Every structure is written in C-alpha cells, then in structure tokens.
UniProtKB/TrEMBL annotation, chains A, B:
It is found in: Host endosome, Host multivesicular body; Virion membrane. It comes from Human immunodeficiency virus type 1 (HIV-1). It comes from the Viruses. The keyword Nucleotide-binding does not apply. This is Protease. It is a lipid-anchor. Residues 20-89 form the Peptidase A2 domain. The gene is pol. Pfam families: RVP.
C-alpha cells in the first residue's frame, strides 16, 4: 500500500498468533515491541533514543507479518512507549519513502 | 525521490544559514532539531521517546527546505542527538510510505 502521514502510520502486525498495532518508524534502526512473551533464547541488549537508553531483550529470527507482508528478523522487547517497526524489518517488506 | 531504508534516511535541510542533515522520520509526530539559537517567540514543551522525556523549545511558522521542497511549520529545538523531520513537515513535502 501507499501510506500518507497526516495520521500516525499504525498498522496491524501478527507475531506468534497475536495481533498488535505497531508504528512504521523510519527513524528507528531496530524493531522494538512492548513487554510480551516470545519463545526461544534472548540476549540482553541496550538501545537508545531521544530520552536516553533502555534495557531490552533481543530475539533473533522471529517471524512477523506486517500489514500482510512477511518478515523474519530481530525483534527487541522492552519498555518502549509504543510498538515500533524499524528499518531492519521495513527493508524486508520492501518499504521505501517517496515524495 | 525514492529513499530505501537500508541506511538511515538522512537528507539535507535548510533552516536559515544552517544547512543540516536530518532524518525523515515517520515515527516522529513533530520535527525536533538539535540545539540552535533561533530567533522569535517560543513555548516550552516536553516530548517523550525511548528512554523518557526531553525538554524542547517550540517555535512556530519556521520555514524549512527539505531536499528543495519548501515547508513551513512548528519546529521543536532541544537536546536531541539527531535532527528529526516529523510528520508535520513530511506531509507538506508530499512524503509517503510505500510497500
Ligand atoms: C514514540 C515513538 C518514537 C520512539 C519517537 N521517536 C522517533 C523515533 O523515530 C526515534 C528517532 C531517533 C533516532 C536516533 C536518536 C534519537 C531519536 N528513534 C529511536 O528512538 C530509535 C529507537 C530504536 C532503537 C528502536 N533509535 C535509533 C538509534 O534508531 S522520538 O525521536 O523520540 C520523537 C520524535 C518526535 C516527536 N514528536 C512528538 S513526541 C516525539 C518523539
């Protein structure tokens, strides 16, 4: 699809049989979801943004379907203000910016 | 232009006699610029992201040129690590997400 930006580009993602709303975030290097359970091993990681750094759990090679498009990649889980789809998965679904 | 997301979507912007590099950021509601001593009236604001909140100065009706596309609107100025072009100006230059 083509998504304009007068509203937040929120979309429905599917991850582990669960539907969630997430923000398509071109200013985010990585994908970070609010606290949830995911299966498998994780690694502690720290990521930073405008307000400083947080601790997250890094899960690798996780399937997520984003607005019907398949990605499999790294998903961080932690105290993000909102669920964020970052460039690591936006590239997988063929997302570009256009003007 | 079409901008892929393999790397950070940095572009050149001009605000007065400072050309700057800034992120085209679909996850940003507002435009947030690194500290600069802009003229005119402003209002204090707090904005939240990963890690918490920062204090910024809200300037209104500031002209900004983004890759030769003219925009004019609200610009927040504060201790952000990166210049961020948010949706308030992305809409003005006709920017969409496409996949
Ligand atoms: C709440 C939704 C988001 C968090 C709002 N922000 C925009 C976001 O794209 C930022 C941009 C960024 C990049 C590098 C360094 C710092 C920031 N990315 C990030 O914080 C990402 C996070 C990833 C690590 C997952 N950081 C990096 C290094 O990519 S935000 O920058 O915090 C932001 C921007 C505008 C705005 N207007 C009103 S509230 C508000 C919040």
């Amino acid at each position: 699809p083509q998504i304009t930006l007068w509203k937040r580009p929120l979309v429905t993602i599917r991850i582990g049989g669960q539907l969630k709303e997430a923000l398509l975030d071109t200013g985010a290097d990585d994908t970070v979801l609010e606290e949830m359970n995911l299966p498998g091993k994780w690694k502690p990681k720290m990521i930073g943004g405008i307000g400083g750094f947080i601790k997250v759990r890094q899960y690798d090679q996780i399937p997520i379907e984003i607005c019907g498009h398949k990605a499999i990649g790294t998903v961080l889980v932690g105290p993000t203000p909102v669920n964020i789809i970052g460039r690591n998965l936006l590239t997988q679904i063929g997302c570009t910016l256009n003007f």
